[PDB]
Amino acid sequence: AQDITTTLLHPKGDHVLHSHAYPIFQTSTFCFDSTQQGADLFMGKGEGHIYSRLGNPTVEQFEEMVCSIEGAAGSAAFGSGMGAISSSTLAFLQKGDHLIAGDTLYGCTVSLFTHWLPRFGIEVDLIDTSDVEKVKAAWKPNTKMVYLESPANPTCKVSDIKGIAVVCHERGARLVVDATFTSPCFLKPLELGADIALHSVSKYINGHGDVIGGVSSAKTAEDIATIKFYRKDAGSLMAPMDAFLCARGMKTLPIRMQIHMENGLKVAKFLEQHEKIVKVNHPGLESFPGHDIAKKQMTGYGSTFLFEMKSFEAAKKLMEHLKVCTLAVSLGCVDTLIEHPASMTHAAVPENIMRKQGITPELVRISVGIENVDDIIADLKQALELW
Amino acid sequence: AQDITTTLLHPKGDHVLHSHAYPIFQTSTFCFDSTQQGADLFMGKGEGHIYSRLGNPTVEQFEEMVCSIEGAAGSAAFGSGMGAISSSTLAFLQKGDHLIAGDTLYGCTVSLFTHWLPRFGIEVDLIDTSDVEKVKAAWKPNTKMVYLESPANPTCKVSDIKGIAVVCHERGARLVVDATFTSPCFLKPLELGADIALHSVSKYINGHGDVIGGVSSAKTAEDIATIKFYRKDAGSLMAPMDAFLCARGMKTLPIRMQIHMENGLKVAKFLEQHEKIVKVNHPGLESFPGHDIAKKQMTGYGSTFLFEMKSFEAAKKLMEHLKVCTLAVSLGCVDTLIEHPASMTHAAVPENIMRKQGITPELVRISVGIENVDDIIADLKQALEL
Amino acid sequence: DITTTLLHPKGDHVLHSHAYPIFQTSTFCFDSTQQGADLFMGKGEGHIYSRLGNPTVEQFEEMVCSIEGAAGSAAFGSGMGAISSSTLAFLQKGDHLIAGDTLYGCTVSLFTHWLPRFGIEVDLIDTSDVEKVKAAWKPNTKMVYLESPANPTCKVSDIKGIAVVCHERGARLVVDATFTSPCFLKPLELGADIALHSVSKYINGHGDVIGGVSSAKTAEDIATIKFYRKDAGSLMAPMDAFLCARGMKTLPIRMQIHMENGLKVAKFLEQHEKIVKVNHPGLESFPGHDIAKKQMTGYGSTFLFEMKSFEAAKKLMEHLKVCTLAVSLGCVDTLIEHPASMTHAAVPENIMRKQGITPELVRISVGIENVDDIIADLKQALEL
Amino acid sequence: AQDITTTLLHPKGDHVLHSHAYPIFQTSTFCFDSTQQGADLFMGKGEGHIYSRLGNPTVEQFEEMVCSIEGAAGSAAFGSGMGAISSSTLAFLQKGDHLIAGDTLYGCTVSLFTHWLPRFGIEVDLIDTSDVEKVKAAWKPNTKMVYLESPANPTCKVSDIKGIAVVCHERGARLVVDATFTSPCFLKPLELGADIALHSVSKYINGHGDVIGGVSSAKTAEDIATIKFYRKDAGSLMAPMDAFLCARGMKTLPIRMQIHMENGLKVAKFLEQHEKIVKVNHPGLESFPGHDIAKKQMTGYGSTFLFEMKSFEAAKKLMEHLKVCTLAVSLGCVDTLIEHPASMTHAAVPENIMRKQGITPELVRISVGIENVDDIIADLKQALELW
Numbered sequence A, D: 001a002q003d004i005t006t007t008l009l010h011p012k013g014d015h016v017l018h019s020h021a022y023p024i025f026q027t028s029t030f031c032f033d034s035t036q037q038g039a040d041l042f043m044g045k046g047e048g049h050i051y052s053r054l055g056n057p058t059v060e061q062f063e064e065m066v067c068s069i070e071g072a073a074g075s076a077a078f079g080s081g082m083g084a085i086s087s088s089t090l091a092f093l094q095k096g097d098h099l100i101a102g103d104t105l106y107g108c109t110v111s112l113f114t115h116w117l118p119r120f121g122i123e124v125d126l127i128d129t130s131d132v133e134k135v136k137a138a139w140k141p142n143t144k145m146v147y148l149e150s151p152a153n154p155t156c157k158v159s160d161i162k163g164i165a166v167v168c169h170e171r172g173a174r175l176v177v178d179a180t181f182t183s184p185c186f187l188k189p190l191e192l193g194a195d196i197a198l199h200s201v202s203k204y205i206n207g208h209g210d211v212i213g214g215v216s217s218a219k220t221a222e223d224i225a226t227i228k229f230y231r232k233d234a235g236s237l238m239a240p241m242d243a244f245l246c247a248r249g250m251k252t253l254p255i256r257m258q259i260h261m262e263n264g265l266k267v268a269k270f271l272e273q274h275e276k277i278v279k280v281n282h283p284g285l286e287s288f289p290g291h292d293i294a295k296k297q298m299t300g301y302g303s304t305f306l307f308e309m310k311s312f313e314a315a316k317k318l319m320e321h322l323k324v325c326t327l328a329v330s331l332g333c334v335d336t337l338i339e340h341p342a343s344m345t346h347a348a349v350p351e352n353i354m355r356k357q358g359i360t361p362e363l364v365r366i367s368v369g370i371e372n373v374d375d376i377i378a379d380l381k382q383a384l385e386l387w
Numbered sequence B: 001a002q003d004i005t006t007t008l009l010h011p012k013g014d015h016v017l018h019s020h021a022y023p024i025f026q027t028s029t030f031c032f033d034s035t036q037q038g039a040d041l042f043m044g045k046g047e048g049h050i051y052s053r054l055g056n057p058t059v060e061q062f063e064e065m066v067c068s069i070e071g072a073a074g075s076a077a078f079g080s081g082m083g084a085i086s087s088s089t090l091a092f093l094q095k096g097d098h099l100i101a102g103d104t105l106y107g108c109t110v111s112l113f114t115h116w117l118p119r120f121g122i123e124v125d126l127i128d129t130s131d132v133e134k135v136k137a138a139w140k141p142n143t144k145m146v147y148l149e150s151p152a153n154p155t156c157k158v159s160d161i162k163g164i165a166v167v168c169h170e171r172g173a174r175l176v177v178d179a180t181f182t183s184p185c186f187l188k189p190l191e192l193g194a195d196i197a198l199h200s201v202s203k204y205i206n207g208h209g210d211v212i213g214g215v216s217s218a219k220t221a222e223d224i225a226t227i228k229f230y231r232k233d234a235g236s237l238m239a240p241m242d243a244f245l246c247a248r249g250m251k252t253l254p255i256r257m258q259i260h261m262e263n264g265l266k267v268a269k270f271l272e273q274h275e276k277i278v279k280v281n282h283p284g285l286e287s288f289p290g291h292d293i294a295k296k297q298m299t300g301y302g303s304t305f306l307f308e309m310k311s312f313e314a315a316k317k318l319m320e321h322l323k324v325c326t327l328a329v330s331l332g333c334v335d336t337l338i339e340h341p342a343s344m345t346h347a348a349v350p351e352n353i354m355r356k357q358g359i360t361p362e363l364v365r366i367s368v369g370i371e372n373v374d375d376i377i378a379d380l381k382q383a384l385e386l
Numbered sequence C: 001d002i003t004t005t006l007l008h009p010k011g012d013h014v015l016h017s018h019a020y021p022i023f024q025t026s027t028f029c030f031d032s033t034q035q036g037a038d039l040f041m042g043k044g045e046g047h048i049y050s051r052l053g054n055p056t057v058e059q060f061e062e063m064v065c066s067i068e069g070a071a072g073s074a075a076f077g078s079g080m081g082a083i084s085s086s087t088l089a090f091l092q093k094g095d096h097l098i099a100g101d102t103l104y105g106c107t108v109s110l111f112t113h114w115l116p117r118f119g120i121e122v123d124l125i126d127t128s129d130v131e132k133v134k135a136a137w138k139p140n141t142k143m144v145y146l147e148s149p150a151n152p153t154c155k156v157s158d159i160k161g162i163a164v165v166c167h168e169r170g171a172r173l174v175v176d177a178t179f180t181s182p183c184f185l186k187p188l189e190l191g192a193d194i195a196l197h198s199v200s201k202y203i204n205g206h207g208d209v210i211g212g213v214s215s216a217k218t219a220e221d222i223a224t225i226k227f228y229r230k231d232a233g234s235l236m237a238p239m240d241a242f243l244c245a246r247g248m249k250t251l252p253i254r255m256q257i258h259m260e261n262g263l264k265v266a267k268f269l270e271q272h273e274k275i276v277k278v279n280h281p282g283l284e285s286f287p288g289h290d291i292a293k294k295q296m297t298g299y300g301s302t303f304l305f306e307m308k309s310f311e312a313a314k315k316l317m318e319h320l321k322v323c324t325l326a327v328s329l330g331c332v333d334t335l336i337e338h339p340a341s342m343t344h345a346a347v348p349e350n351i352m353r354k355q356g357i358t359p360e361l362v363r364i365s366v367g368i369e370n371v372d373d374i375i376a377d378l379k380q381a382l383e384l
Ligand SMILES: C/C=C(/N=C/c1c(COP(=O)(O)O)cnc(C)c1O)C(=O)O
Pocket: A051, A053, A235, B080, B081, B082, B083, B106, B108, B149, B153, B178, B180, B181, B199, B200, B201, B202, B203, B212, B213, B214, B329, B330, B331, B345
């Protein structure tokens, strides 16, 4: 079996004009040979292109690379992770349907599900998905979808994807998994029973902090077609230049993820033993509740996780005296990022959800990059040891 | 008194690092000076950026440009015209609401309004908006929006935006106008009483056929904030490179439109007097129904219009023996495009709606570019003789 | 007219794409050893490596080639790359070059500092007078190099007459037509052997690319230019070639407006009490207007005018609200510059005085803004 | 000391408008605050920009990154490696000067030294620089420069850079080293006594096969200013978009080089023991003449090297039956490339030099990428074992 490293460096498809790098198709439209050839293409007959919103070759190349690592029937690229999320939910859910989603999600996902979905007649419950019994108890005759992020952003809370998939499969609901925090190198939700696996490509997949994009991959040709049907009318598109950048970033994904994983674990162990640190929420630590599930269902760990300081003032002093780590939101970049969830990424999450997400002013989230790990640790140590 | 040409060439804003051209901010995220500065930005306090989905300086520069020409409170850029349309309607409409839309729309707009909105519990009636009394008859107690394209894609049917706007003001509904076909140089819906004016930037505004993008502009600060709030969660973004290209394309918009207008008018009159053409639907032709409303409510015409051949075989013969004109969907590019609506742009629209639209296999849609008009006329002339 | 040709360039579409794709690649794949071997020998159609040939760059080359009436065109990383490749590709130790006495600053630097280190004799002379060219002639003269109208004074040379001397005496005529664009000046049509532009200016026209292009009358000459380029390495990036081809789609239309704006602004300045003199080739008062009207089909919109003092020039340049103080020219928006202390600051004083550049001169590059807005901007800054 | 990985991820300089990624300054010109402020910049007084040919912020950012790894006084970026070579030689050499260069060089470098320099009255001798005594024997009172590639493209012939530097330093000649084949992670010519270190950035530094570019770094402020002065008139510029891509590719250079080095050595050892293979020219092999100099003067190896088949026909059979390796010129890409020097990269080298260079139709050059090394070896092995 050929390694993922090789597969990503050797994607299927013909070269264009013998070009070694896949060209950037910075075009809106495509030319027809004849009236029939164009008419046929609109009916889905024959091979070729019409218009970049419907399909663009550079973007299609990136989709195939994601499709190849997910083990999907197809993938669809979007202008952002939120585009991928919207199109993976609202492509299926309609007025009268019920959605069960995790109670700890990325802020804008909470916004989508709690503000917009109810305006469209869609019933939503945010449930603690780390407990399958609670998922079952929240199930209704009109439940059509379960949506999970695991490990959750930012607390790393682990859900049992495999166990929840069984219930979805017995009861006719789609299981959708946002695997952004871990990357398709370490978490393949379609192998665990999910119907759709999505990512903010803005994070690890692209990895270079210079594009915003989303991707969604479906187990079934019918589901990926419906997703693309929705995309056509909702209009969240990956730009050709951004697809070129994302495919390029993804060429180094496996080796970056190996370094991220090892760095993140070493940084978490350093913090876990440090006097100033109260707790570390990294799912690769044995102290972490849900570690046994993460270890079974994933083949590695991302490097973004959260830790607890003794006070808000101590969190502030740390985050503001770092020379290698950069104070900024986002994650999964080659360089190390740090932020304060309570006042930043999750300052917009309703208080009812803040308290049961478990997010407090003492928490700091770090996204460990691929810098030499000793340099990252020395940077944290010097700020922790300040006068 | 400063001319539109000058305004687009001299946008408001500081230069970045003294750079003459506005830099391409190809970044996802922005750095914070301190915990407080970041927390302040998340609360809308102070000046600065956080993350490109919330706001990107290169994108914002293009948004300001469009906002200037529309006379808007603010503008929002998107990944596509369909992103602008989705975000300008579903940002406001919710379950139990009712939408009145023109019956002749771009194909994917029909798919949006006919397939997705009713799945979200939104009631939708497609009606002939060229007659204001028909809009009034279709009105219900829960009508929250009227959505228009004028001149319509592809038949160029004209609606009285100004009169429909009065009805909307009186009865508590938003008026949303898709002005893609005409461009903001010639049609300014917000000056006519609309609440929202939107464009597929993919067409005239960019004008170079190398970008897909959308833009929407709102009369009020509250409405554009709502649109951007929807965009934050729906995620149709204009990429920084595409915003760089759209702004650059828009620098020549006024001169390009002037040529497009004059070129398209001349080509339509050539066709209108040719023996093989049954009729030409150009809103600037005296013969066109609705010409009188278009000359009053617009300050010029786009150059995309349709004309009728005697049969499908004739249309097929014309479209396939052109040497300058390119057989392709889309419009508003620098070069001339030509298309068969029945089996291309409007192939997926249900028979029911399509016959209401008056779209038949005998119609050909041309998008006249900025070539020497004589080369376009001679191309058509050559082909019409075979 | 020219617009149709630029919008419909020859060649096949790639994957049916309407816009020509950006080949952001260094290398190309071979079907077999033989096919690679053949390509390196110039046999068969195809590509090897972007420095030898990139499809996106070649499409832009083809566009310029068509408008110039050339055997071929080569694109470069800057106008200076085009200039140095159109000269040092041909000149060698022992050769003599005659160049116009008034040239862009870096061209003077190239001809004055570098060429003589390579053993190439160079004299700068007044090429507005053909007898001076004949008098500077030597038995080893292999090239005459010209800018017309010259940067920044707009000094006009008789290109056709000089070409005649060159053809008779066995020298190449190379012409930098940056200031006018190939819409209005076609040197190869006037007898010149090579015609070149800084694409950074009018051709691209959007102020967001630096690039150069050179076009030769003969297949041999362009092949030599590209062979030099292969080793010297001033290439146009695929992205910049995409942007230049895109900018060039509006070239004939932008030029029409530049020309008209520039002529209206120049006449306004010419009759303004505060202005000593205006150096625009299209004015009747300008010396050599007759040659420029004969040999060109229009004018660019960059020209020089004289103020009554340095303090007055500084006051004008620093109270403008539309015009931007910046070097460069041929952008869609208006630019203004002080030659003596900016573009031409490094020029040796003796070449400087022979050029006629003083601290009282201001150089304007008139954009495509509404003319009345440009004039009203100049008006308030001169009067207030 | 902070690690190179960390340095490259954390370059000196302020952020622009708080942007995390450095913006692409796709501009030709820059604005002046006043006549004086503009005048001053032209005189080298004050901080700021004039015009991209003179300096572009995105390009300067990439230059700073190279400068930091080379340990130089400054770096200059170009539109190609050939731009860097032309500008690092012809910026200093004039009519009457003598240049000693290696006899095994990149083909277009031979073309430059052999066709263009003599036309400019510069005397040139190509010498076997693997023998310091041959360098001394070729020295003349007017020798001003020695120019070396080591390991040479394509034969990997090693020169004693340290030993030749001694001679240059005693006699008033600049030593210039093209370190393209090894990358600045493993070869730092300025630490060995060179005056100038240059690269085709097209190869390893950028690493993604999608940019052509060059860079030159000088030990002395004066020499880098002279290089940039030449560049300003000769006009080989790195485009802003290309500088953005090179800086981005360079963010992963140390980890890519680590994998290239290990992959290349394992592939070389596999070929060395294979019955079909006559000889393997990889400088990290103990069998290689000059291995001892290479291991003392470098801190690793690039992964581009050459091997000898039994015949031209066997070389063609191998090259044309690979599924992972790609038949193309260039090198230093994330994916594996392969080519035939005799009929491709060195087919323009005049017959006397190509004889002295030791290039025969039996030689194949491989540029080993970062694919899984077992997948690369299996691809070579299957082609070598064909019917
Ligand atoms: C291929 C597209 C065509 N039109 C598009 C279009 C859109 C949709 O805009 P994006 O395509 O999403 O940028 C919105 N509004 C109008 C009046 C339109 O014509 C076409 O007809 O040929």
